[PDB]
Amino acid sequence: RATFQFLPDEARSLPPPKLTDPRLAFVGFLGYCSGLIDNAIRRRPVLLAGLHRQLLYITSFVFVGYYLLKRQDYMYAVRDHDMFSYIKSHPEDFPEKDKKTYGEVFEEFHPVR
């Protein structure tokens, strides 16, 4: 909500992404793939070379990805909060219907002959 803010303060009333979040694991896997591609384009032993460099690729991807997921989760909470508050404010636009059973509702039968 707050102008030009990545994580408005109201977002702290939401639970943070777990560090075992499957999306965070995928992001970390992307960091690992980036490390391997880095070795490959420089003709270094792909798996073994420069493990410190590979570690930083994983850690930096996870670090940024954690805050993106935190903001992603927040923005969908805001979408739900806005939509339900609007439904409360305009009941006549969202009437609760009378539900009829299939014994009462007429549906045409189309034979497959």
Partner 1 sequence: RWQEDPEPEDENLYEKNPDSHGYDKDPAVDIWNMRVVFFFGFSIVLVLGSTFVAYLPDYRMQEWARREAERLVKYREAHGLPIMESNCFDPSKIQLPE
Partner 2 sequence: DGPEKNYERTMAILQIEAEKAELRLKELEVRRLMRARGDGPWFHYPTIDKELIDHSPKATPDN
Partner 3 sequence: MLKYIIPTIMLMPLTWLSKNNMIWVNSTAHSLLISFTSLLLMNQFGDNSLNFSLLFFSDSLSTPLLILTMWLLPLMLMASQHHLSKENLTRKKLFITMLISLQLFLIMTFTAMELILFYILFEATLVPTLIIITRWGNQTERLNAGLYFLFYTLAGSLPLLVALIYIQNTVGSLNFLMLQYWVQPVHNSWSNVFMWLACMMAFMVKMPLYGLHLWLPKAHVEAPIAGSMVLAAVLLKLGGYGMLRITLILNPMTDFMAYPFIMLSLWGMIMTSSICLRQTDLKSLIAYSSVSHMALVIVAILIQTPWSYMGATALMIAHGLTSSMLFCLANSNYERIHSRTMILARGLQTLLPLMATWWLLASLTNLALPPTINLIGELFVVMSTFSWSNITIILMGVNMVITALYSLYMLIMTQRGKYTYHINNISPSFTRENALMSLHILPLLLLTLNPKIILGPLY
Ligand X SMILES: N=C(N)NC(=N)NCCc1ccc(I)c(Cl)c1
The residues of the shown chain that bind partner 2, judged by CB under 8 A, are 79-80, 82-83, 86-87, 90, 93-94
Size of the site for ligand X (CB under 6 A): 4
Site membership for partner 1, residue 109 (CB under 8 A) = no
Site membership for partner 3, residue 110 (CB under 8 A) = yes
We find the least distance from the C-beta atom of residue 107 to partner 1, in angstroms, to be: 10
CA angle 33, 69, 60 (to 5 degrees): 40
* The binder of ligand X chosen from 63, 76, 84, 86 (CB under 6 A): 76
Site membership for ligand X, residue 79 (CB under 6 A) = yes
Binding site for ligand 3PE (CB under 6 A): 27, 30, 33, 36-38, 40, 45-47, 53, 56-57, 60-61, 63-65, 68
